Design a protein around this nucleic acid. Structure first.
Lengths: 148, 259
RNA sequence: GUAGUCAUAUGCUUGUCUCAAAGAUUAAGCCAUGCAUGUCUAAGUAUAAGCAAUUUAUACAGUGAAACUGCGAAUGGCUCAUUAAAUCAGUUAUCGUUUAUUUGAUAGUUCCUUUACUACAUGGUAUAACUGUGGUAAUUCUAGAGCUAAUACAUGCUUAAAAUCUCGACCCUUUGGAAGAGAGUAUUUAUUAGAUGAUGAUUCAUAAUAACUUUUCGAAUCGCAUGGCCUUGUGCUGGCGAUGGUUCAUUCAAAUUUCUGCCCUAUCAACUUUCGAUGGUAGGAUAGUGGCCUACCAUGGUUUCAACGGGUAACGGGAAUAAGGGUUCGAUUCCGGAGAGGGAGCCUGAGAAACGGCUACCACAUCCAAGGAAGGCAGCAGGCGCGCAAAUUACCCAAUCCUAAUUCAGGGAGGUAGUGACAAUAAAUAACGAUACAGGGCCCAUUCGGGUCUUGUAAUUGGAAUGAGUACAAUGUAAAUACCUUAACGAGGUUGGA
């Protein structure tokens, strides 16, 4: 199978995590799937898989070696507060990313031309996804998850 | 011009930040603070590119905005993406109790020196101006834009004080005079540390100074660029890159690859 | 002559790889269509379930609607059109000028009414927002009704006596006791400091100092932190920040400012003086320097080192290596003045000669129930045009930068693409091999001689050649992240001469 060598590692107590460079050796098989790399790593570190997030990879011009960077968080409860909204939909935890631009630009249109009376109403119709909403969803992953 | 500038360009941001040329297009513009634009290191630079504790831009936004307080500058808390940490400062990374010196290389790049809980106490201050103000009282001012009340009177304008941050107390100062140790804050010669030889004032509007050091090199710079790192040979703080002394491109080679 | 043109010249048109260019260039042709600087809590304002959305702080939870806020919206960004001018370069501190920004600092003398100081168990208002009543071809319209805020107007004794400042005897030793010694600032001048800071430097300060100034100053903050102190309600305890003010320098600046330098020209000789050409002066402006002007006068002085002056559409020009060489940079102007119909006046403010604020005027120039009621996108694209000349009105703010209020607002930055020989590159894409079968060869300059000898199978072998799909995560446009790089899973069909 694969052979991973961990390369450059820092210790960030601030965001409570350790950052490391990864060098996957797959001489034979094609680039490793982030997923599979996620676990062969968690095993060498001996840490829950979901508390280890791996991002950015490459693949030297045909040679079976891929470089990448990963993250080790101690509390998935920390990981959930720090990681980016986009990395979460990626583990299928946060979800969708609907097209805000267009409509938001159009509401600006109406609102900029009204008095408070209606404005409030309009606002009660701008494409969802509040941050207040992002949190409640983040929170639910919090309680409902426990293990390792 | 329209009013007052407000941004900063990748390309235009000082070589002291050892910045990413390809990077982006801009660069965190230092906030009006204790140190001048060019002579400073905004925190975002300090953690992201320097320490490397942060990374992406939002990484900082967390660190300095997080209700925990992870960054200290001279015994105080800071939460500004670009607080201008300047020369001879002391920065502490709360969550790890890290203590650093904000000092220039020997090649003029901002370097982070690791201090022991010991030096982390004292910080070196250089004297800006000295005059008496309100109700018969004496005031001294430091480069670090420190304003001092009732300071020891044996202190001339171009002095250097040792500061006990813990007690916001002064102790053992030392003016610049033939026979001391110094650090040059900026110039074609910054990052160097030697023995003051003599100070020829020319009054016409610009006095100069000379210096010697380890390999006994001859140095020349304007007073405004001399910072007294100490009195009579003994330096007061641990210097980065060994001793404050740079090598010929020739000496670097022979030391490293031994040619 | 020669052909070639390593001439084009354009004139014919084909795997895989990308550091990746494309209406400044014409006129400084503008706003079709598309489009657009607002904003947050420890933090200032929200209903004793009519913002109200819960939910049961509960005398004010969140929670937000809306507003109030309070902020930026003088930033840029495109634009020489000018401009031969310091424009600009250096090259000036500014004793000559202004200063948010940022800190640092920071502020006892406000009465003393002839303390019902009332009494601060911190004032008054005023308002929205708000419920509503409306209007009108129709407004960022607006009317009239009511509301309520308040970190906004508008304030406002700071007691509990003899306030508090400032000598100090004295002992009484410290707790010092100290007697009784005496008593704040923006705005003015006017003196005196200043012998006893500082400059070369001062009439400098920062002093005072009086006066006398429709003149200031001075946290009716909020936030958690309310548990320690004694009291026992108490008195505190304010902690700590938020929310201020203060002046100084604190960068912010600018803003001057010397000191070198645009093309030519003597066929530039001379120049400049009615008010400036000069000096010098009174003032006044100027925020504040200045003939900048009011004067008032000085006659000034510039100048062949060509001055007056002329003529060069002129908008306009940073890195570093380097025996030698190697090389190269910042990146289509680092630098850096003048436009955003015409004109005018005005606008913000720390902070605009405010482009993208006005007005009003002009002009254009438009909607219309007749009435009124528009409108200036060289910050974009787009069609006309122009008409020389070039890609969808992609993706994201993934960075990294931006603004920005206590967050993670927002960033037309930036980025990402695509398109796209754009300039392109690359230069790598059916052959390796099984056998038979064999005609004799096939070539020559060949005329005949010569050379000698495989050559056809439209015969029978080769690997599970390889290509193309399939998870494959992904350096990865945290979304491009299946399109990359994998990985594999699978998987070969010009000429001439009859």
């Amino acid at each position: 199978t694969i052979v991973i060598r961990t390369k450059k590692i820092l210790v960030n107590p601030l965001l409570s995590r350790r950052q490391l460079s990864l060098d996957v050796l797959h001489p034979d098989s094609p680039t490793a799937s982030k997923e599979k790399i996620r676990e062969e790593l968690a095993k060498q570190l001996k840490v829950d898989a979901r508390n280890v997030v791996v991002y950015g990879f490459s693949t030297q011009y045909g040679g079976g070696k891929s470089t990448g960077f990963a993250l080790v968080y101690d509390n998935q409860q920390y990981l959930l507060k720090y990681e980016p909204n986009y990395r979460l939909r990626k583990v299928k935890i946060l979800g969708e990313k609907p097209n805000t631009r267009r409509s938001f630009k159009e509401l600006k249109r109406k609102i900029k031309r009204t008095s408070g009376k209606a404005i409030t109403k309009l606002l009660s119709e701008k494409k969802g996804d509040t941050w207040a909403s992002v949190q409640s969803k983040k929170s639910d992953h919090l309680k409902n998850f426990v293990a390792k | 011009a329209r009013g007052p500038k407000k941004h900063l360009k990748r390309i235009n941001a000082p070589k002291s930040w050892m910045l990413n040329k390809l990077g982006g297009i801009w660069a965190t513009r230092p906030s009006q603070g204790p140190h001048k634009l060019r002579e400073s290191l905004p925190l975002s630079v300090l953690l992201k590119e320097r320490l490397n504790y942060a990374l992406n831009g939002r990484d900082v936004t967390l660190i300095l905005n997080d209700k925990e307080q992870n960054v200290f500058v001279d015994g105080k808390v800071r939460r500004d993406k670009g607080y201008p940490t300047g020369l001879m400062d002391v920065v502490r990374i709360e969550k790890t109790d890290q203590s650093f010196r904000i000092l220039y290389d020997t090649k003029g790049r901002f370097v982070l020196k690791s201090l022991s809980k010991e030096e982390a106490k004292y910080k070196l201050l250089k004297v800006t101006a000295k005059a008496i103000g309100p109700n018969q009282i004496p005031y001294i001012v430091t480069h670090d834009s420190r304003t001092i009340r009732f300071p020891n009177p044996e202190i001339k304008i171009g002095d250097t004080l040792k500061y006990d941050l813990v007690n916001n107390k002064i102790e053992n100062f030392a003016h610049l005079e033939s026979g001391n140790v110094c650090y040059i804050q900026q110039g074609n010669n910054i990052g160097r540390v030697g023995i003051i030889q003599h100070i020829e004032k020319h009054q016409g509007s610009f006095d100069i100074c000379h210096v010697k050091d380890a390999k006994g090199n001859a140095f020349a710079t304007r007073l405004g660029n001399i910072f007294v790192l100490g009195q009579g040979k003994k330096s007061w703080i641990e210097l980065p890159s060994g001793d404050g002394v740079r090598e010929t491109i020739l000496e670097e080679r022979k030391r490293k690859f031994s040619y």
